[PDB]
Amino acid sequence: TLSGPQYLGEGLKLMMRPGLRLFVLLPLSINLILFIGLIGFAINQFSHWVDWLMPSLPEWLSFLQFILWPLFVTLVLLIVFFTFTLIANLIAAPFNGFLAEKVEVVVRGTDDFPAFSWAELMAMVPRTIGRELRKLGYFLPRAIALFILSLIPGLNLIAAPLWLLFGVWMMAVQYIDYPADNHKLGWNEMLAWLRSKRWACMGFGGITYLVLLIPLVNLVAMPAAVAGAVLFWVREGGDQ
Amino acid sequence: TLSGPQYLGEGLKLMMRPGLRLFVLLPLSINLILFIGLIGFAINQFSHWVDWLMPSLPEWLSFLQFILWPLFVTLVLLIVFFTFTLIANLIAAPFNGFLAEKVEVVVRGTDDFPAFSWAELMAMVPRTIGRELRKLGYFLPRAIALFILSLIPGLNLIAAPLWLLFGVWMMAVQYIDYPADNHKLGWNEMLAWLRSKRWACMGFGGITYLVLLIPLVNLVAMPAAVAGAVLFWVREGGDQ
Amino acid sequence: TLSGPQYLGEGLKLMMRPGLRLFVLLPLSINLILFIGLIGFAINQFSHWVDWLMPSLPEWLSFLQFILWPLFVTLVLLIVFFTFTLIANLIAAPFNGFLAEKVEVVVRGTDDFPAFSWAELMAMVPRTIGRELRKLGYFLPRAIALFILSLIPGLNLIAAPLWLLFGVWMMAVQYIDYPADNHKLGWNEMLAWLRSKRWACMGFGGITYLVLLIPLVNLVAMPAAVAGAVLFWVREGGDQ
Amino acid sequence: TLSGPQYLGEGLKLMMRPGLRLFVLLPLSINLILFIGLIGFAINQFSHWVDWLMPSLPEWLSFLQFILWPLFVTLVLLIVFFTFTLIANLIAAPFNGFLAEKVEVVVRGTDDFPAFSWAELMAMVPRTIGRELRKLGYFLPRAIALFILSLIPGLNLIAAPLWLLFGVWMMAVQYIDYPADNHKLGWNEMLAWLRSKRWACMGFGGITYLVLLIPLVNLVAMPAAVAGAVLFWVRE
Amino acid sequence: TLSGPQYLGEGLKLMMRPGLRLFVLLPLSINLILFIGLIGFAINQFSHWVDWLMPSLPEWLSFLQFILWPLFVTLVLLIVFFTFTLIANLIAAPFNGFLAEKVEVVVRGTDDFPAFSWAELMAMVPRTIGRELRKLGYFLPRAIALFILSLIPGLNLIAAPLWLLFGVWMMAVQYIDYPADNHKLGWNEMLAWLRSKRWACMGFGGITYLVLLIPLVNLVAMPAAVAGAVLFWVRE
Amino acid sequence: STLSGPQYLGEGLKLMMRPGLRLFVLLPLSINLILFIGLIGFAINQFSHWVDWLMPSLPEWLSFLQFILWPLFVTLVLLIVFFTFTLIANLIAAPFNGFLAEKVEVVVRGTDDFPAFSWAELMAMVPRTIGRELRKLGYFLPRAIALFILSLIPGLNLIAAPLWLLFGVWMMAVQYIDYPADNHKLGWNEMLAWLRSKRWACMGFGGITYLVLLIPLVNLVAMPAAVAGAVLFWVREGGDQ
Ligand SMILES: CCCCCCCCO[C@@H]1O[C@H](CO)[C@@H](O)[C@H](O)[C@H]1O
Ligand SMILES: CCCCCCCCO[C@@H]1O[C@H](CO)[C@@H](O)[C@H](O)[C@H]1O
Ligand SMILES: CCCCCCCCO[C@@H]1O[C@H](CO)[C@@H](O)[C@H](O)[C@H]1O
Ligand SMILES: CCCCCCCCO[C@@H]1O[C@H](CO)[C@@H](O)[C@H](O)[C@H]1O
Ligand SMILES: CCCCCCCCO[C@@H]1O[C@H](CO)[C@@H](O)[C@H](O)[C@H]1O
Ligand SMILES: CCCCCCCCO[C@@H]1O[C@H](CO)[C@@H](O)[C@H](O)[C@H]1O
Ligand SMILES: CCCCCCCCO[C@@H]1O[C@H](CO)[C@@H](O)[C@H](O)[C@H]1O
Ligand SMILES: CCCCCCCCO[C@@H]1O[C@H](CO)[C@@H](O)[C@H](O)[C@H]1O
Ligand SMILES: CCCCCCCCO[C@@H]1O[C@H](CO)[C@@H](O)[C@H](O)[C@H]1O
Ligand SMILES: CCCCCCCCO[C@@H]1O[C@H](CO)[C@@H](O)[C@H](O)[C@H]1O
Ligand SMILES: CCCCCCCCO[C@@H]1O[C@H](CO)[C@@H](O)[C@H](O)[C@H]1O
Ligand SMILES: CCCCCCCCO[C@@H]1O[C@H](CO)[C@@H](O)[C@H](O)[C@H]1O
Ligand SMILES: CCCCCCCCO[C@@H]1O[C@H](CO)[C@@H](O)[C@H](O)[C@H]1O
Ligand SMILES: CCCCCCCCO[C@@H]1O[C@H](CO)[C@@H](O)[C@H](O)[C@H]1O
Ligand SMILES: CCCCCCCCO[C@@H]1O[C@H](CO)[C@@H](O)[C@H](O)[C@H]1O
Ligand SMILES: CCCCCCCCO[C@@H]1O[C@H](CO)[C@@H](O)[C@H](O)[C@H]1O
Ligand SMILES: CCCCCCCCO[C@@H]1O[C@H](CO)[C@@H](O)[C@H](O)[C@H]1O
Ligand SMILES: CCCCCCCCO[C@@H]1O[C@H](CO)[C@@H](O)[C@H](O)[C@H]1O
Ligand SMILES: CCCCCCCCO[C@@H]1O[C@H](CO)[C@@H](O)[C@H](O)[C@H]1O
Ligand SMILES: CCCCCCCCO[C@@H]1O[C@H](CO)[C@@H](O)[C@H](O)[C@H]1O
């Protein structure tokens, strides 16, 4: 009855109520620390990194340095961004998993005020980081496939839609995974599960993608998305 | 003999001969009268309608009115336009049906000079208005669907071609129905009928679409699209 | 002697050195709190806002509520975004201003390690906030002008360049004022004085804007722009 | 007095009152007849025209006919439009002029119910047809100029604004003329009269442009623009 | 182990070795002689073609010849180019096959080098020219179709990819045909063959497409494509 | 005298068509042939290597970037190869154009309707005419890079497209109308002043010359036509100093 994007909205509701409300701070804080620590580092090495990527040129081709400069400078940033993002989700991987349990007990009425402890969090770290690596393995190859498909002057027009649709579906697997993996469910079994809910989890993943495009709101958005995903897992069925 | 778009042309021929020659003036004359009557009222009401759609705003945001004015003024115009066409087509519905019948008797040779009588027209009105409503009910949801699909950044590129192709298929169903409905044929039965004749009525629909973009020529073109569709019905199966 | 976009570069150096590094953490924490506070506010009021703007309609026009809904949701979003920006800048105004003085004493050689104190910061707040209000009062009119010029289908092509040319100039008056305002210097007087350094401060503002197009940069760049602007005030004319 | 375009708006008020707008239905009904005639004609001869325009080609180049077919067809269509747009406006020239007088007596209070008689219309025809022909002469060179400039890849960017600004300015000279021409004023004297105040005509013609973009509303926007122009002639 | 676009590279290698390096010169010589004569021809007759294709208009409509001018000029140019491109490749058709055979024997170790003889080339000419005429018969209708498809306002977006995919596929059928036609390969069986090998021959055809986008490098790239197509024929 | 505008290029094509000047049309093509035939092989063998030079060395983790970085440098390299080639070819065409311009002049002035080609005087021209094309490049490439950097700015590109076009036309005037002018020991600055006084005429000439040189197979006939047309522009409009 709740199928579609409605879950996301409801997930936000689940985050606003006390005792789950303070867990919302986790992603931002991660990205905060990771930013502040890394930013300074990046600041010092930015100049050096481009100097490594740029080839040595003779005096006659030295003019190419003017055209090649903006490139690697862009590329470095593109790397520094992606690298950071890559780490952020990794450090955010356990917390989200830990959250997906704590949301669930509230969804079913078991304990409306779940408690945070580092013990069970550190105990979750390996399966949930490894699971973040499985997600990365499922995503990144297909991403490079669609992107190289888009670099072709003829074929990009079919790549833009495939890109979008895939990114939505990935919003389904990324977040609905957290309760599925917390129920020790196989990767294949969960992807088949989402394949059976493809319309529902495509709507959920879709509005999740959209609301996750808002830059500052990303950080309040993700916890809502996790909780909404847990709700998805409870309202669709955890039989597998 | 004629398969493909050729029917439209032949429809023109049929409308050129005496006795069917004046009905070409029915659509044009309708849109004249309709406009002449409505324009007046519209002029007075237009100003008010936008003020209604425009939100009531506080002092600091009042500058937004300067930017919201064009949008709402645009929107109302669009609505004011569609309504017009929507009403016009409705009023054009029976006259078309009455033509598709009267063209048919000429195509099959029963009466070389059919007469116009308001009696059987008014007798037609409720059913034919009902069918134009069934057509709008078929079209408007799929149209909206395509449009929402166009506002999606990734999927818009797949939205344009689908819009064209559907608008063509719709040109088949709008006009080939007039004789089919005159023959008391089920809606789904005609849609499957045309789905088996996909190519033929997709060609007829195609040229009918193109020619009916030409702005004022529409009102002379349409009766040709009717007669042409009656020909599509006569020269191809009347079987049910 | 020392000139061009290099100021920004040099300004960055001043921020990295022992004694001036932690001041960069002042705006971020603010933007954190300001975000954390406002975002929750937005979360709760969002419905009421989009419902306020939306007009009350009769039953048959109720379908319009579907087209007006995304619109207002966007509009509200934009307000929420711009309002945030507007507030953020304002709160950033004194921390910027307070910095422009503290950078200065480091540039001159009195004290290599300045200390932060809430007393004189709070003593600065009203003057500097009123200052940046003078800035918004100088900027927002010319901005609205160029924007009404760009809405005209014909003139919009000359609006894009005219936009950029002003945006670079603005970069000068925003930052270079911070030390000047600490020296009790008049608004129109500073406008006249910088009207002479137009080229230098336009290079400063040029690299300032471009370098401000990157997201990572901004959080570390505004301090670099403030320090570089202080440096610009010291090595060139402080005369009055 | 009335800043920017209010004249058009005020002009529309004038047209909506009974007595000043049955006059609107006159040229429209004619252009209807014109429309019906020209369309039927083109129906009969469209094939003759495209076969005339198409060159005779060999069997190896016969497939070229397949690319030439859409072309002349387009071309014929275009001519057919412009001819009509040209003729209709031509036929519209006197009625508008005849209206511009009949508007003025209502503006100044002379006669609240103007009388329509074919006599004084036919008497206007030569002067007002000549006058609209002068307007076509002022317009077409600068229009072709901007179109050719707009074909240029680099300079096309300067052709789009110059197009709009001209298309707006022209809306002044056509309409604000109808009263001036009724006052027996020289062409050059009127262009100096309009260039005397650029902003005013620029707003009047500006909204008149935008409002003449609305598809069926043209038919009511034009009369408004005439009377507003009459109003524009009287108040200033 | 060698599948994919690598064949292109390898074909290049085969053409670098002595005795096969003389085979590179002929397509260049064809484009050269043919080009020089046909271009001198083009300059004198151009005026007659554009004047021939352009229709007779009355003197009022005379101005239309100004818009039709850039068009027909363009059109003639396109014909001029296509005709050249049409003829050019025809004359290269047998030299290709005659080359293809001489490459195959090098792949299997049969021949270190063969002295060219006009005899066997002339013996090939009618069959292989009939073969490339059949290639034109497969190609040109799909192209005109895709072009009419690109004229459609909605479907033009689906025309852009459809072109490329076919342009690549054609580059498979064009070159991999030449060894096939050396073996009297029946038309249906080769098209099915390349349809069963879609990935390999489509990558081969792909790099062939792209490297053939390079203008003067076309001339050295085509022999590499022929050699690569023979290797594609032998190893799979 | 009445011949002002872009008509010069047409008339120049006419001059190249009459006997005595007709085979000089083959001077550019042959050049572009030879320069290609010599270079082509070299380039191919070393193309693979050049991209590998410009491409950065990346670790195990950043190796995937090679999939996106590869096509880039390959294009970049190609571009350079093209520009450099077109650079070099134009240099070799510099004396021939000048020589042709000189020879065209005697046909235009009715002195010798069938001028003879001799390697003596062409080789005599080489140093002057090359140096003068180096000056042409010096006038062009800085201003061109300026327009390109200006087009890189997000706000100002819209003003970079027209400026680019107009400057390209103007450079057509400078390049071709210079050829007769250099033959009469005319200074660089003073010819820029003279063309600046003929800006309407030579800007039309440079306009059609530009367009005709955009068509690839046609440009081989048009380049001589542009030289001759430029000689006629020099003859019919003051060659005075
Ligand atoms: C756009 C730049 C945003 C701030 C982060 C990178 C700033 C790098 O800045 C530079 O760092 C170099 C060492 O890496 C020093 O040599 C320079 O003096 C310093 O200006
Ligand atoms: C403000 C920054 C917004 C960028 C949002 C882009 C969303 C990309 O998508 C994400 O890429 C990540 C790796 O980078 C993976 O961890 C995720 O599984 C994948 O969904
Ligand atoms: C991660 C933050 C996600 C916010 C997703 C919000 C989805 C909101 O959903 C909207 O909220 C309103 C609630 O009153 C409803 O009236 C609307 O009909 C509903 O679409
Ligand atoms: C474009 C001109 C449209 C004409 C407006 C309507 C018909 C003439 O206008 C008015 O219409 C009224 C009813 O609306 C009639 O009662 C009046 O007799 C009338 O003059
Ligand atoms: C273009 C000039 C005006 C076109 C018609 C204006 C409509 C006039 O007004 C309309 O008709 C009656 C008066 O005529 C009024 O009483 C009606 O209330 C109004 O709807
Ligand atoms: C869809 C047709 C509407 C576009 C034409 C112009 C509408 C402008 O409507 C304005 O409303 C005013 C309010 O009374 C009236 O004085 C006039 O009707 C007019 O000035
Ligand atoms: C293109 C930029 C804005 C053009 C001017 C918009 C003026 C908006 O002003 C509007 O005028 C209307 C009456 O004329 C009123 O109904 C509105 O309430 C008022 O906001
Ligand atoms: C596209 C048209 C915009 C929708 C708004 C239509 C007007 C809705 O507003 C309506 O206006 C009427 C007349 O003023 C009033 O009688 C009604 O009380 C009011 O509901
Ligand atoms: C004042 C009444 C509201 C505005 C009327 C909009 C009527 C538009 O009507 C449409 O105009 C098209 C051209 O635009 C024609 O091609 C169509 O045949 C016609 O249905
Ligand atoms: C940019 C900030 C986006 C805010 C999206 C907020 C959507 C959630 O909204 C919140 O949840 C309720 C539903 O339970 C809504 O009715 C109210 O807006 C609010 O309480
Ligand atoms: C097609 C564009 C329609 C815009 C309609 C604007 C008319 C709004 O309404 C009118 O605005 C006038 C100002 O011109 C005022 O003088 C009138 O009192 C007012 O009724
Ligand atoms: C095809 C039908 C054409 C209709 C043309 C209507 C001509 C207008 O008719 C005029 O109307 C005036 C009041 O408006 C009266 O004052 C005039 O005496 C009358 O001639
Ligand atoms: C369908 C609604 C009425 C149809 C009749 C309109 C006849 C056209 O009318 C004419 O059209 C020309 C070009 O659009 C205009 O320039 C003329 O002023 C106009 O009189
Ligand atoms: C450029 C192709 C040929 C010209 C086509 C446009 C013909 C119609 O053009 C219009 O006719 C009116 C007559 O009054 C003029 O006043 C208008 O300004 C003019 O645009
Ligand atoms: C083959 C014949 C094609 C000629 C069709 C006549 C088109 C006249 O159509 C007119 O176009 C105008 C815009 O220019 C619209 O604003 C008018 O409402 C409409 O009447
Ligand atoms: C249609 C009349 C002009 C000829 C159009 C085709 C242009 C050239 O077409 C080419 O022909 C070559 C062989 O000639 C083939 O190798 C290519 O696959 C093909 O693209
Ligand atoms: C209306 C007829 C349209 C025919 C267009 C076909 C023109 C041939 O297009 C061909 O495509 C090849 C790659 O695909 C290129 O290598 C050739 O240069 C080329 O001329
Ligand atoms: C690179 C080698 C140059 C050969 C190309 C043409 C140069 C010679 O050109 C020829 O010179 C003859 C007399 O010498 C003239 O009579 C010919 O008309 C002329 O065409
Ligand atoms: C960004 C668009 C690039 C188009 C292709 C390269 C155009 C510039 O090309 C250059 O023009 C110069 C001036 O005459 C010549 O000196 C150079 O030889 C030539 O390479
Ligand atoms: C050494 C291999 C590099 C290849 C560079 C060749 C680029 C050739 O360039 C082409 O040459 C023709 C004249 O020669 C011109 O007609 C074309 O405009 C041009 O694109």
Numbering used by the authors:
A (entry chain E), B (entry chain F), C (entry chain D): 3 to 242
D (entry chain A), E (entry chain B): 3 to 238
F (entry chain C): 2 to 242
Authors' own words:
CysZ family members are 28–30 kDa bacterial inner-membrane proteins found exclusively in prokaryotes with no apparent homology to any of the established channel or transporter folds, and are scarcely studied in the literature. The CysZ protomer is an alpha-helical integral membrane protein with two long transmembrane (TM) helices (H2b and H3a) and two pairs of shorter helices (H4b-H5a and H7-H8) that insert only partially into the membrane (hemi-penetrating), forming a funnel or tripod-like shape within the membrane. The protein has an extra-membranous hydrophilic ‘head’, comprising an iris-like arrangement of the two short helices, H1 and H6, and kinked helices H3b, H4a, and H5b. Besides not resembling other transporter structures, CysZ mediates sulfate flux into cells or proteoliposomes without coupling to ion gradients, partner proteins, or exogenous energy sources such as ATP.
Third, we determined the structure of PdCysZ, which crystallized in multiple forms belonging to space groups P63, P4122 and P212121, revealing the same architecture and oligomeric assembly each time. We focused our analysis on the best of these (3.4 Å resolution in P63). The location of the selenium sites was obtained from a SeMet SAD data set, and the structure was solved by combining the resulting SAD phases with those from a molecular replacement solution obtained by positioning the PfCysZ model (75% sequence identity) onto SeMet fiducials in the initial electron density map. The refined structure of PdCysZ comprises an entire hexamer of near-perfect D3 symmetry. Antiparallel pairs of protomers arrange together as a trimer of dimers, with the three-fold axis oriented perpendicular to the plane of the putative membrane and three two-fold axes between dimers of the hexamer. Both the periplasmic and cytoplasmic faces of the hexamer are essentially identical by symmetry, resulting in a dual-topology assembly for PdCysZ. The hexamer has a triangular face of equal sides measuring approximately 75 Å, with the perpendicular span of about 65 Å. A surface electrostatic representation reveals a hydrophobic belt along the mid-section of the hexamer when viewed from its side, outlining the orientation of CysZ in the lipid bilayer. In the structure of PdCysZ, the entrance of the putative pore appears to be closed by the network of charge-interactions by conserved residues, R110, E106, N184, H185 and W235. Following this polar environment, the putative pathway widens even further leading into a large, primarily hydrophobic, internal cavity encapsulated by the TM helices of the PdCysZ hexamer, located in the plane of the lipid bilayer.
